[PDB]
């Protein structure tokens, strides 16, 4: 006999567990904060299978995963689930463009490599020279 | 669910991955002494929608992989293969 | 606790592609306790960059900021 | 050794400049030094995540070798990318 | 845009294990991957120069981009 449990036994929220979402962390009309969405991910180079059925998605917050680019030269913290290579990786070219921004890592990085090329490893171009 | 009338089940999902998140929240607020925005457990219950639906495609490209219709442990062991501290503790809560 | 386990059936039956996957109670029960160290992790992150930054609230902008690192270690 | 990781390098820089170049031509605009250079550290960081992802991926299958489905599963999260390569796998 | 055998290379310098092995389709495959990713990358740096109207790429578009470009690929 336990009316608590009783009425959440099943993948929804219970009556009860509805009014505390209701009241306490629901976005409504009254808060006037925008709705925090993820972007959604679009190849330039690919036919997109469209995730285009919102249109409204403006009238929320975008969460920007580049506005904090300065912060993500460095490890940030860790509390139970510890950095990936995935992430160390991100990480290390960040690192890397950010010595690269005072000029100096640039033209390095091309002056090191440039040694170890060996043409048979390549696919070989006409230089058309958009580089600046 | 699949391309029509199934904005509903969504809808009630995301409230109810947002009553979780808010209720571990508070959790983790009384272990830290901060309290957590609206908008700030608003966003987190979105991003674990979204890597919800990231973890359902992962799992069930890893089981018809092996030849299986059915998600097992190793589904979800070859999931948090990346990171050492997840992957040992699904070593140590899936065997267990 | 965290999430029930027909919950999380319910949300991983939403983005299958196929109708006869299925999923262990074992399964099940392990990505229950993985969708709650997420939140953990995010809430926990986004709590200790306000505690950088002296701060007593936790608002958008340290979800923001932990965000791209938070989602490269649990890809 | 190192040398060997210097010459893989070399390549992907200069197969990244070419492609860059490719992409400079369609939408008419110049690609810096330092962006070049950014891109190709990417990429080169990117085959190693490729790597160890099949490996793991093979031996999921009970298999040593990695195959087309491997590649495949890389894809596995977004429908384009999805439906992309596995057109390319069967016409191969 | 990438040779077959230098994508073998690069496979094999990352793997842990010596008894692991690529087939040609694969390293095909491969090739195309690598090349899409790196056209990827070139295609939304761009995109965001024009968006400043600016016809000059620099590594101030590589950082709008690169967190999104690595989530896309997995």
């Known amino acids: 006999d336990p009316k608590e449990m009783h009425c959440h036994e099943n993948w929804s929220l219970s009556p009860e567990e509805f009014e505390i979402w209701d009241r306490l962390y629901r976005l409504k009309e009254n808060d006037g904060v925008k709705e925090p969405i993820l972007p959604h991910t679009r190849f330039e180079t690919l036919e997109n299978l469209d995730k285009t059925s919102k249109p409204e998605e403006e009238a929320a917050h975008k969460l920007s995963l580049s506005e904090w680019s300065i912060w993500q030269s460095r490890p940030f913290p860790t509390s139970m689930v510890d950095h990936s290579d995935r992430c160390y990786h991100f990480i290390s070219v960040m690192e890397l463009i950010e010595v690269m921004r005072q000029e100096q890592g640039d033209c390095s990085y091309e002056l090191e490599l440039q040694p170890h090329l060996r043409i048979e490893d390549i696919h070989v171009r006409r230089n058309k020279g958009h580089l600046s | 669910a699949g391309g029509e009338q199934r904005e509903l089940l969504i809808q009630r999902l995301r409230a109810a991955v947002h009553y979780t998140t808010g209720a571990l929240a508070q959790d983790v607020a009384e272990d830290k002494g901060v309290l957590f925005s609206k908008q700030t457990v608003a966003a987190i219950s979105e991003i674990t929608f979204r890597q919800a639906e990231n973890f359902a495609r992962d799992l069930e490209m890893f089981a018809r992989h092996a030849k299986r219709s059915t998600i097992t442990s190793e589904d979800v062991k070859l999931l948090a293969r990346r990171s050492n501290s997840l992957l040992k503790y699904i070593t140590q809560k899936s065997d267990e | ?75």
């Open chain 3, 1 to 75: 606790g965290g999430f029930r386990k027909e919950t999380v059936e319910r949300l991983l039956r939403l983005h299958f592609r196929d109708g006869r996957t299925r999923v262990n109670g074992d399964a099940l029960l392990l990505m229950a306790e993985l969708l709650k160290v997420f939140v953990r992790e995010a809430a926990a992150r986004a709590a200790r960059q306000a505690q950088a930054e002296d701060l007593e609230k936790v608002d958008i902008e340290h979800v923001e900021k932990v965000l791209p690192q938070l989602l490269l270690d649990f890809v």
